[PDB]
Coordinates of all heavy atoms in Angstrom, one line a residue:
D1 N 134.1 156.9 30.1 CA 135.3 156.4 30.9 C 135.7 155.0 30.5 O 136.2 154.2 31.3 CB 135.0 156.6 32.4 CG 135.6 157.8 33.0 OD1 136.2 158.6 32.3 OD2 135.5 157.9 34.3
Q2 N 135.6 154.7 29.2 CA 136.0 153.4 28.7 C 137.4 153.4 28.6 O 138.0 154.4 28.0 CB 135.2 153.1 27.4 CG 135.5 151.7 26.9 CD 135.1 151.4 25.4 OE1 136.0 151.0 24.6 NE2 133.9 151.4 25.1
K3 N 138.1 152.3 29.0 CA 139.6 152.2 28.8 C 139.8 151.9 27.3 O 139.0 151.2 26.6 CB 140.1 151.1 29.6 CG 140.2 151.6 31.1 CD 140.5 150.5 32.1 CE 140.6 151.0 33.5 NZ 141.0 150.0 34.5
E4 N 140.9 152.4 26.7 CA 141.2 152.2 25.3 C 141.8 150.9 25.1 O 142.8 150.5 25.8 CB 142.1 153.3 24.9 CG 142.7 153.1 23.5 CD 143.2 154.4 22.8 OE1 143.1 155.4 23.4 OE2 143.6 154.3 21.6
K5 N 141.3 150.2 24.1 CA 141.9 148.9 23.8 C 141.9 148.6 22.3 O 141.1 149.2 21.6 CB 141.2 147.7 24.4 CG 141.2 147.8 26.0 CD 140.5 146.6 26.7 CE 140.3 146.8 28.1 NZ 141.4 146.8 29.0
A6 N 142.8 147.7 21.8 CA 142.9 147.5 20.4 C 143.3 146.0 20.2 O 143.9 145.4 21.1 CB 144.0 148.5 19.8
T7 N 143.2 145.4 19.0 CA 143.8 144.1 18.7 C 145.3 144.3 18.4 O 145.7 145.3 18.3 CB 143.2 143.5 17.4 OG1 143.5 144.4 16.3 CG2 141.6 143.6 17.5
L8 N 146.1 143.2 18.2 CA 147.5 143.3 17.9 C 147.8 144.0 16.6 O 148.8 144.6 16.5 CB 148.3 142.0 18.0 CG 149.8 142.0 18.0 CD1 150.3 142.7 19.2 CD2 150.2 140.5 18.0
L9 N 146.8 143.9 15.7 CA 146.9 144.7 14.4 C 146.4 146.2 14.5 O 146.5 146.9 13.5 CB 146.0 144.0 13.3 CG 146.6 142.7 12.8 CD1 146.0 142.2 11.6 CD2 148.2 142.8 12.6
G10 N 145.9 146.6 15.6 CA 145.6 148.0 15.9 C 144.1 148.4 15.7 O 143.8 149.5 15.8
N11 N 143.3 147.4 15.4 CA 141.9 147.8 15.2 C 141.3 148.1 16.5 O 141.6 147.5 17.5 CB 141.2 146.6 14.5 CG 141.6 146.5 13.0 OD1 141.7 147.5 12.4 ND2 141.6 145.3 12.5
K12 N 140.3 149.1 16.5 CA 139.7 149.5 17.7 C 138.8 148.5 18.3 O 138.0 147.9 17.6 CB 138.8 150.7 17.5 CG 139.6 151.9 17.1 CD 138.7 152.9 16.4 CE 139.4 153.9 15.4 NZ 138.5 154.9 14.9
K13 N 138.9 148.3 19.6 CA 137.9 147.5 20.4 C 137.0 148.5 20.9 O 137.3 149.7 21.1 CB 138.6 146.7 21.4 CG 139.4 145.5 20.8 CD 139.9 144.6 21.9 CE 140.8 143.5 21.4 NZ 141.2 142.6 22.5
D14 N 135.7 148.1 21.3 CA 134.7 149.0 21.9 C 133.8 148.2 22.8 O 134.2 147.1 23.1 CB 134.0 149.8 20.7 CG 133.5 151.1 21.2 OD1 133.0 151.4 22.3 OD2 133.5 152.1 20.3
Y15 N 132.7 148.8 23.1 CA 131.8 148.0 24.0 C 131.3 146.6 23.6 O 131.1 145.8 24.4 CB 130.6 148.9 24.4 CG 129.7 149.4 23.3 CD1 128.7 148.7 22.9 CD2 129.9 150.7 22.7 CE1 127.8 149.1 21.9 CE2 129.1 151.1 21.7 CZ 128.0 150.3 21.3 OH 127.1 150.7 20.4
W16 N 131.3 146.4 22.3 CA 131.0 145.1 21.8 C 131.9 144.1 22.4 O 131.6 142.9 22.8 CB 131.2 145.1 20.3 CG 131.4 143.7 19.6 CD1 132.5 143.3 19.0 CD2 130.4 142.6 19.5 NE1 132.4 142.1 18.6 CE2 131.1 141.6 18.9 CE3 129.1 142.4 19.9 CZ2 130.5 140.4 18.6 CZ3 128.5 141.2 19.7 CH2 129.2 140.2 19.0
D17 N 133.2 144.4 22.4 CA 134.3 143.6 22.9 C 134.1 143.4 24.4 O 134.4 142.3 24.9 CB 135.6 144.1 22.5 CG 135.8 144.3 21.0 OD1 136.1 143.3 20.4 OD2 135.6 145.3 20.5
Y18 N 133.7 144.4 25.1 CA 133.3 144.2 26.5 C 132.2 143.2 26.7 O 132.3 142.3 27.5 CB 132.9 145.6 27.1 CG 132.2 145.6 28.4 CD1 132.8 145.1 29.6 CD2 130.9 146.0 28.5 CE1 132.2 145.1 30.8 CE2 130.3 146.0 29.7 CZ 130.9 145.5 30.9 OH 130.2 145.5 32.0
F19 N 131.1 143.3 25.9 CA 130.1 142.4 26.0 C 130.5 141.0 25.7 O 130.1 140.0 26.4 CB 129.0 142.7 24.9 CG 128.2 144.0 25.1 CD1 127.7 144.6 24.0 CD2 128.1 144.7 26.3 CE1 126.9 145.8 24.1 CE2 127.4 145.9 26.4 CZ 126.8 146.4 25.2
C20 N 131.4 140.8 24.7 CA 131.9 139.4 24.4 C 132.7 138.9 25.6 O 132.6 137.7 26.0 CB 132.8 139.4 23.2 SG 131.9 139.7 21.6
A21 N 133.5 139.7 26.2 CA 134.3 139.3 27.3 C 133.5 138.9 28.5 O 133.8 137.9 29.3 CB 135.3 140.4 27.7
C22 N 132.4 139.5 28.7 CA 131.4 139.2 29.8 C 130.6 138.0 29.5 O 130.3 137.1 30.4 CB 130.5 140.3 30.1 SG 131.2 141.8 30.8
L23 N 130.1 137.9 28.3 CA 129.0 136.9 28.0 C 129.3 135.8 26.9 O 128.4 134.9 26.6 CB 127.9 137.6 27.3 CG 127.3 138.8 28.0 CD1 126.4 139.6 27.0 CD2 126.7 138.4 29.3
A24 N 130.4 135.8 26.1 CA 130.5 135.0 24.9 C 130.4 133.5 25.3 O 130.0 132.7 24.6 CB 131.8 135.2 24.1
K25 N 131.0 133.3 26.5 CA 130.9 132.0 27.1 C 130.2 132.4 28.4 O 130.9 133.0 29.2 CB 132.3 131.5 27.4 CG 133.5 132.0 26.6 CD 134.8 131.6 27.2 CE 136.0 132.4 26.6 NZ 137.2 132.1 27.4

């Protein structure tokens, strides 16, 4: 039930990107 997301160039985001959003800072 992951929402679909991408960069402005179209590359796929995934759970790694969720982890960065939660934790990178």
Side-chain angles (χ1 to χ4, degrees):
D1 260 6
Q2 185 199 122
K3 291 170 175 183
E4 166 157 5
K5 298 184 193 290
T7 65
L8 191 63
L9 294 191
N11 285 323
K12 292 162 205 185
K13 288 190 185 181
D14 209 322
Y15 58 87
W16 160 245
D17 301 275
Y18 167 61
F19 294 156
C20 291
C22 292
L23 308 167
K25 334 169 197 171

